[PDB]
């Protein structure tokens, strides 16, 4: 498999490593999202230590108002993070 194909699989793998822990196995609730960010994005994003901070991230990511981040919404999060990285985190 190419690096791109492996990367695609990694995105799926990390989502399901967190989404399945609690409640709906197909969505990240705020507690799962906090864990994913703190454990898997520690070199790109600041550690989340306050509930208000993860509340704000979920508010941004949750486009259908169910209070959770589904796979489609996670893809949008990935695009945000990747765009930030692409621009050398300048913004």
The residues facing 70 across adjacent strands are none
70 is known to lie in a ligand binding site: no
Largest CA distance in the chain: 40
Among 60, 66, 72, 82, binds Ca ion (CB under 5 A): 66
Closest-CA residue to 19 (of 6, 8, 33, 7): 33
Q: Is 46 helix (H, G, I), strand (E, B) or coil?
A: coil
Nearer to Ca ion, 19 or 54 (CB): 19
Q: How far is the CB of 41 from Ca ion (least distance, A)?
A: 18
Q: How far is the CB of 49 from a copy of itself (least distance, A)?
A: 19
Tell me: does residue 53 bind a copy of itself (CB under 8 A): no
């Amino acid at each position: 498999m190419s690096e791109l194909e492996k990367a695609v699989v990694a995105l799926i793998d990390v989502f399901h490593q967190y989404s399945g822990r609690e409640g709906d196995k197909h969505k990240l609730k705020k507690s799962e999202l906090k864990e994913l960010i703190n454990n898997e994005l520690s070199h790109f994003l600041e550690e989340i230590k306050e509930q208000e901070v993860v509340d704000k991230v979920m508010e941004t990511l949750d486009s259908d108002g169910d209070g959770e981040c589904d796979f489609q919404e996670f893809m949008a999060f990935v695009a945000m993070i990747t765009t930030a990285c692409h621009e050398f985190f300048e913004h």
